[PDB]
């Protein structure tokens, strides 16, 4: 999946320009995660962020979920990837990062029994209420 990376960037840009002020931002960050699924290629989370920081209150839950979709099947490196974008070190005030972060670990390591079951077990012991126990 990494040695056959012919995706197209300009189609995603020729749909980017027609994005008006609707809630299509979630519809675009689910679109790129589909056509970069398992690719482990982060360029939209690199080349622009101010358009990504426009939508809120569930799109942050969707965007950090889409980070796990691009890294599907990423066994050891996905742990240290979100041991960089931790549930408590990005920002302690936003529960949508730590909610969709734990949801992203489940998206990566589906059908893989290991410590990540126990790692998510211990963080459902100590968690907040609403949009932490969802993605957990």
Partner 1 sequence: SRTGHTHMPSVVGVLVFTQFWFWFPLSHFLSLAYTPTCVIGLNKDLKMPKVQYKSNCKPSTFAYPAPLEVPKEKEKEKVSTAVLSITAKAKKKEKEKEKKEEEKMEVDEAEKKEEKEKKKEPEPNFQLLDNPARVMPAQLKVLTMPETCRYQPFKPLSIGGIIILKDTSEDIEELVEP
Partner 2 sequence: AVDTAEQVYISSLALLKMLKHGRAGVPMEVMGLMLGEFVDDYTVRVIDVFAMPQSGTGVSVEAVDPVFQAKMLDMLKQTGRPEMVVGWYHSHPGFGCWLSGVDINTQQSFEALSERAVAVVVDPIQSVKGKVVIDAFRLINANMMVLGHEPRQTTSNLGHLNKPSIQALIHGLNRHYYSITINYRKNELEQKMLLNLHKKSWMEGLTLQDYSEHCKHNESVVKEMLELAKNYNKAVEEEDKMTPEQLAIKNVGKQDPKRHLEEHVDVLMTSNIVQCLAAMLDTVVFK
- Give residues in contact with partner 2 (CB under 8 A): 21, 23, 26, 57-58, 62
CA distance 89 to 29: 23
Give the one entry of partner 1, partner 2, none that residue 3 binds, where binding means its C-beta sits below a cut-off of 5 to 8 angstroms depending on kind: partner 1
Least CB distance to partner 1 at residue 2 (A): 8
Least CB distance to partner 2 at residue 8 (A): 27
Cβ 98 vs Cβ 129: under 8 Å: no
Cβ 5 vs Cβ 41: under 8 Å: yes
- Is the CB of 30 or the CB of 52 nearer to partner 1? 30
Least CB distance to partner 2 at residue 21 (A): 6
Q: Footprint of partner 1 on this chain (CB under 8 A)?
A: 1, 3-4, 6, 8, 10-11, 14, 26, 30, 33-34, 37-38, 58, 61-62, 65-66, 68-69, 72, 100, 103, 107, 110-111
CA distance 1 to 112: 19
């Amino acid at each position: 999946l990494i040695r056959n990376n012919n995706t197209d960037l300009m189609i995603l840009k020729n749909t980017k320009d027609a994005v008006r002020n609707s809630v299509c931002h979630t519809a675009t960050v689910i679109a790129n995660s589909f056509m970069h699924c398992g690719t482990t290629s982060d360029q939209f989370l690199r080349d622009n962020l101010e358009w990504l920081a426009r939508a809120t209150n569930w799109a942050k839950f969707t965007a950090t979920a889409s980070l796990g979709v691009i890294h599907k099947g990423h066994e050891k490196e996905a742990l240290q990837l979100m041991a960089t974008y931790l549930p408590k070190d990005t920002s302690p005030g936003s529960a949508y990062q730590e909610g969709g972060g734990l949801y992203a670990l489940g998206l990566i390591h589906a059908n893989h029994g290991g410590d990540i079951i126990d790692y998510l077990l211990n963080q459902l012991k100590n968690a907040s209420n609403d949009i932490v126990r969802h993605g957990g």
